[PDB]
Design a protein around this ligand. Structure first.
Ligand SMILES: C[C@H](C[C@@H](C[C@H](C[C@@H](C[C@@H](CCN1CCCC1=O)N1CCCC1=O)N1CCCC1=O)N1CCCC1=O)N1CCCC1=O)N1CCCC1=O
Ligand SMILES: COc1cc(CCNC(=O)c2nc(C(C)(C)NC(=O)OCc3ccccc3)[nH]c(=O)c2O)ccc1O
Ligand SMILES: [Mn+2]
Ligand SMILES: [Mn+2]
Length: 178
């Protein structure tokens, strides 16, 4: 009977929450028990969807959201079609304009330690990394932020509004520490 859950349900649009429930249950975690992961997964989802919305109509292939096996199917097809090494871990998008997988991150710490953590998690150099924070800062690999400043700004505004909403419901600190 958690209220982080009711907040996540009133804050994100129903297809985000449906996909997040799908993705957490697929990895054996309960949205109703670990509600703060739930919130994080909706946030990651929505940020990715805004990010794909940011380019031109054919620029991005979306990997997040899909079922793990079809996600790997599309990754495989992108590899065997483009000539890019199959990433060790499932990415988030593929940039046809820039010929590279994109890994998106949303951190409640700051830019840095998350960027280094993911970069050494991947450590295969090929796939692009792009992190945002709940405080408006951002970073992509090689200072190549991929999108134009206004789309990324829209993302940051959304992230800070979510932070504000959680804080006003006093859920922000608990979300921050985990
Ligand atoms: C309304 C939103 C929709 C958009 C999310 C996303 C839709 C779904 C496709 C639906 N499913 C269900 C299973 C099979 C399948 O394909 N998924 C999920 C996997 C990848 C994908 O495409 N997308 C992106 C392209 C157009 C579209 O619908 N979202 C949600 C948050 C912001 C946003 O842009 N839209 C559409 C454009 C304007 C808008 O607000
Ligand atoms: C392992 O269990 C989970 C696995 C998944 C599906 C694969 N997950 C990702 O692809 C992914 N997940 C995260 C979060 C914030 C959820 N955790 C993290 O990886 O950090 N962030 C990302 O940027 C990212 O690409 C969903 C939910 C989970 O709980
Ligand atoms: Mn992912
Ligand atoms: Mn990601």
């Amino acid at each position: 009977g958690s209220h982080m859950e009711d907040f996540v349900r009133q804050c994100f649009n129903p297809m985000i929450v449906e996909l997040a429930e799908k993705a957490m249950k697929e990895y054996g975690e309960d949205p109703k028990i670990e509600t703060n992961k739930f919130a994080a997964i909706c946030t990651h989802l929505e940020v990715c969807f805004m990010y794909s919305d940011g380019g031109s109509k054919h620029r991005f292939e979306i990997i997040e959201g899909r079922d793990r096996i079809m996600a790997w199917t599309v990754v495989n097809s992108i590899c065997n079609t483009t000539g890019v090494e199959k990433p060790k871990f499932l990415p988030d998008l593929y940039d046809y304009k820039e010929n590279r997988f994109i890994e998106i991150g949303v951190t409640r710490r700051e830019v840095h330690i998350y960027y280094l953590e993911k970069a050494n998690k991947i450590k295969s150099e090929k796939t692009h990394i792009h992190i945002f924070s709940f405080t408006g800062e951002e970073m992509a690999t090689k200072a190549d932020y991929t999108l134009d400043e206004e789309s990324r700004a829209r993302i940051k505004t959304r992230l800070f509004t979510i932070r504000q909403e959680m804080a006003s419901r006093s859920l922000w600190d608990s979300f921050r520490q985990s």
